[PDB]
Amino acid sequence: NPNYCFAGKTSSISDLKEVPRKNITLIRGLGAFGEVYEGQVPLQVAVKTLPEVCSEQDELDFLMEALIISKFNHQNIVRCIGVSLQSLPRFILLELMAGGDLKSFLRETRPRPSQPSSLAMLDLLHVARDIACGCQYLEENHFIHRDIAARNCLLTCPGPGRVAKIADFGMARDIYRGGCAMLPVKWMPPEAFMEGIFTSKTDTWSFGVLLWEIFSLGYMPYPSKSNQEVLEFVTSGGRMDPPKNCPGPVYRIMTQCWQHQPEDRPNFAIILERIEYCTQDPDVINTALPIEY
Ligand SMILES: C[C@@H](Oc1cc(-c2cnn(C3CCNCC3)c2)cnc1N)c1c(Cl)ccc(F)c1Cl
Numbered sequence: 001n002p003n004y005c006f007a008g009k010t011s012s013i014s015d016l017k018e019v020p021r022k023n024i025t026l027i028r029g030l031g032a033f034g035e036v037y038e039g040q041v042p043l044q045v046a047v048k049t050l051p052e053v054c055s056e057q058d059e060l061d062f063l064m065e066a067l068i069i070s071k072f073n074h075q076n077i078v079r080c081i082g083v084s085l086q087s088l089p090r091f092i093l094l095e096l097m098a099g100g101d102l103k104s105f106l107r108e109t110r111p112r113p114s115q116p117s118s119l120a121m122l123d124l125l126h127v128a129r130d131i132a133c134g135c136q137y138l139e140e141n142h143f144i145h146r147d148i149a150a151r152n153c154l155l156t157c158p159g160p161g162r163v164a165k166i167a168d169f170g171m172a173r174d175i176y177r178g179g180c181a182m183l184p185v186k187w188m189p190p191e192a193f194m195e196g197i198f199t200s201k202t203d204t205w206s207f208g209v210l211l212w213e214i215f216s217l218g219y220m221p222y223p224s225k226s227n228q229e230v231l232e233f234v235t236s237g238g239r240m241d242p243p244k245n246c247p248g249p250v251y252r253i254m255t256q257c258w259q260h261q262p263e264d265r266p267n268f269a270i271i272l273e274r275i276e277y278c279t280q281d282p283d284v285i286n287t288a289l290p291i292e293y
Pocket residue numbers: 030031036046048078094095096097098099100101151152153154166167168
């Protein structure tokens with residue numbers, strides 16, 4: 001059986017907390033490859049399933065993601081409650097994040113004439129800070145995520161006390177051991193999509209794109225551009241414009257994350273400091289978000 005190494009020590013399937021299948025109840029679906037359910041073990045969980053019709057490589061991928069998530073310990077990375085791998089279909093049990101994924105949340109919670117104050121700049125800055133703290137933890141533990149993006153982040157709840165967390169680690173799992181059209185090229189720096197070079201500064205660039213996602217309130221990056229068009233755009237020095245109403249200090253964090261040379265981009269300690277300074281600036285947090293009519 002395959003092993004996984006993180007933060008010093010090695011782990012195996014035997015290290016995963018196997019939860020008796022009889023102790024697990026599925027409640028409802030929550031919406032690719034394999035289904036997700038709300039469940040109970042009482043402890044409320046999200047249940048990620050492996051389809052019984054799958055390849056041996058699918059099985060190993062599933063095992064590896066379980067090992068990866070179970071080995072993290074940080075408040076801004078989703079918790080793994082355990083697994084149920086000894087019954088079929090196989091389960092991974094995660095912290096239930098009632099707020100759902102960040103991209104969907106931003107789109108469905110955009111300020112509206114019905115909900116004029118559904119969200120403010122400070123809410124967005126807090127989400128950005130949460131994920132940046134998660135990224136800093138990964139960076140200081142030498143883990144490269146490779147796919148930092150709104151679709152891969154979850155929220156504990158829709159309301160004001162919400163906390164954002166990095167939740168999907170499928171790309172990192174694949175590389176740890178696919179095709180061009182499935183690569184998240186719109187979140188990738190030049191050296192990543194050209195040379196296949198990944199470092200912590202890969203995630204910095206991706207975080208810049210996430211920031212754009214956040215302050216655009218859930219738009220797809222590089223509006224109207226295809227993957228190849230973005231590849232050529234970014235390679236030639238092109239960068240996204242500020243999202244609608246985006247404060248200049250926030251846009252500046254994005255453009256620093258998108259420096260062409262990785263050495264010129266900030267690490268996550270610096271990004272955190274700059275996000276913190278934005279949260280302090282009245283001219284930033286007093287800026288009204290656009291109201292979608
Ligand atoms: C694997 C799956 O896990 C969860 C999904 C959800 C989830 C998805 N959608 N919703 C909605 C349920 C109805 N109310 C709004 C949120 C909750 C909550 N916690 C989870 N651990 C998941 C999904 Cl589905 C999407 C992105 C992710 F990063 C992850 Cl990690």
